[PDB]
Design a protein around this ligand. Structure first.
Ligand SMILES: N[C@@H](CCC(=O)N[C@@H](CS(=O)O)C(=O)NCC(=O)O)C(=O)O
Ligand SMILES: N[C@@H](CCC(=O)N[C@@H](CS(=O)O)C(=O)NCC(=O)O)C(=O)O
Ligand SMILES: [Mg+2]
Ligand SMILES: [Mg+2]
Lengths: 203, 203
């Protein structure tokens, strides 16, 4: 299997963490999707990473679909629970984290993909407000628990960890660590996992 | 259960189609998420519809999470297959359709949420190129089959149908019907389903 990804992509980091936790071997292929020379469209018509390309040539996207499928590929470190209700809880956590990332990417892309004369203050403020709200919800949801859903590490934790680390990396001005002590304790723990250690974004 | 949604939202339409197919009763609550008076943030910190609010007050998002959960709530009209590989196929179709919608929404929002002096031609062209590519992939993937995954109607078909109907509604200039006869035949069939008939977008 081949994973088209980048070392900075937080959605791709989620998938890489899952693959590491599951001990699934794969070839990592760094692809710059913002280059006019990108070939990602051979595999993902949406032009995005991550994209997993299977032995047979079948292409899998997006990160949620890849994560769900990877969890079935080994009995090692089950990350998505069996129960429908328990699965709901984990997948909603993942949607919350991914949604925070969607807003953060839009806020970043407003700068990287537009001339100053093409930018909107109100749009960026909207996206930054979603990030703030998502952070508050993550802190409210985690509450006093060990992990997002209680006793066990799941894809919820992976997704949240990737989101918070992305803010550390790209948005150090968003001071979530001051605001939410329970998220700080969570992140301090999760970043000690081998899967996180091995997938830190460069720079 | 309460579904916070709008009658135009294609992501919400996907959920409403699933709920109709499954014969699950729910209260529909129209919510304008673009109004400064929106209260959607009580339930979905990302500020988006659809959002399903359960009897207990628990909030579920996004559309993929709601669709997956709704499929478990009744044995009527199973829309997501049991097999991991078969599930992968359906969920990747859903990601493709949702991704087409993401690009279409961005292209629309460039106009509705920005003054002309805040707009980017290159960004809109990028998004429109994703739509074209996604359409080609949908046509390639469906090929000569009855439904997206072969013999049976699944969430893949729901998602694709919602996407194509959204383009008819909001982007009549994107002439997919001329380009892809197999998608035309697909859409002509799916729009005869009661769930689609009852959820057409107004105007
Ligand atoms: N729903 C998808 C989002 C992936 C995405 O936007 N990836 C960005 C790169 S970012 O992670 O650095 C991407 O590929 N953007 C390229 C584009 O939008 O043209 C998922 O969950 O995998
Ligand atoms: N990943 C989510 C996307 C929903 C969405 O963007 N919904 C739009 C409304 S559109 O369907 O008319 C939305 O709520 N936008 C409000 C905002 O982004 O502030 C899902 O699959 O449900
Ligand atoms: Mg619990
Ligand atoms: Mg098949």
């Amino acid at each position: 299997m081949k994973l088209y990804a980048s070392q900075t992509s937080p959605y791709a980091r989620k998938v890489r963490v899952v693959l590491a936790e599951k001990k699934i071997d794969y070839e990592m292929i760094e692809e710059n999707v913002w280059s006019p020379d990108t070939t990602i469209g051979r595999f993902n018509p949406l032009g995005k990473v991550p994209c997993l390309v299977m032995e047979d040539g079948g292409a899998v996207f997006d990160s949620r679909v890849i994560a769900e499928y990877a969890d079935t590929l080994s009995p090692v470190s089950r990350l998505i629970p069996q129960g429908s209700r328990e699965r709901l809880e984990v997948r909603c956590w993942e949607a919350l984290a991914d949604g925070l990332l969607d807003a953060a990417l839009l806020a970043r892309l407003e700068v990287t993909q537009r001339k100053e004369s093409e930018r909107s203050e109100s749009w960026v403020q909207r996206q930054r407000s979603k990030i703030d709200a998502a952070l508050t919800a993550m802190s409210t949801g985690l509450a006093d628990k060990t992990w997002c859903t209680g006793t066990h590490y799941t894809l919820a934790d992976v997704a949240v960890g990737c989101a918070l680390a992305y803010l550390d990396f790209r948005f150090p001005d968003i001071a979530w660590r001051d605001r939410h002590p329970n998220l700080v304790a969570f992140q301090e723990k999760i970043e000690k996992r081998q899967s996180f250690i091995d997938t830190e974004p460069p720079r």
